Design a protein around this ligand. Sequence first.
Ligand SMILES: Cc1nnn(C2CCNCC2)c1-c1cccc(Oc2cc(Br)ccc2Br)n1
Ligand SMILES: [Cl-]
Ligand SMILES: [Cl-]
Length: 126
Amino acid sequence: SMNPPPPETSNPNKPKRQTNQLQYLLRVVLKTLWKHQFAWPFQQPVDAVKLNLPDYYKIIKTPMDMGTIKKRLENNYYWNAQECIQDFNTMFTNCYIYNKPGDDIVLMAEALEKLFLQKINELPTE
Ligand SMILES: Cc1nnn(C2CCNCC2)c1-c1cccc(Oc2cc(Br)ccc2Br)n1
Ligand SMILES: [Cl-]
Ligand SMILES: [Cl-]
């Protein structure tokens, strides 16, 4: 197919945790970023058929998006907060890798990344 399968959101053998930091990543970080005016391109996997981008998955080999992250958090997919943070990082970096400095989508990712970093500086630590 032209679209690869989307990243998994379940994996029965993988060991899982529920932690306060992961709960905060869902309730506060993800759900706030989700409502930002620039969130919509990032709310679902890139559909290369819909978007007419036969090169997207030629370039991006570790796709990630906030819809996948949301489902992973809801399904308790992660072991720890850093694992989820890594998925956000992959999503932003993919956008920079596929696009160009100054593109509208890159301006959006830059703004979202700054907001993300601001929110993860407030991760509960106690
Ligand atoms: C993520 C992501 N990373 N790159 N892209 C496009 C950006 C445009 N070029 C091809 C790659 C997306 C993406 C995902 C869903 C919808 C969507 O829609 C657009 C958004 C803008 Br802002 C501008 C134009 C479009 Br179409 N873009
Ligand atoms: Cl647990
Ligand atoms: Cl199309």
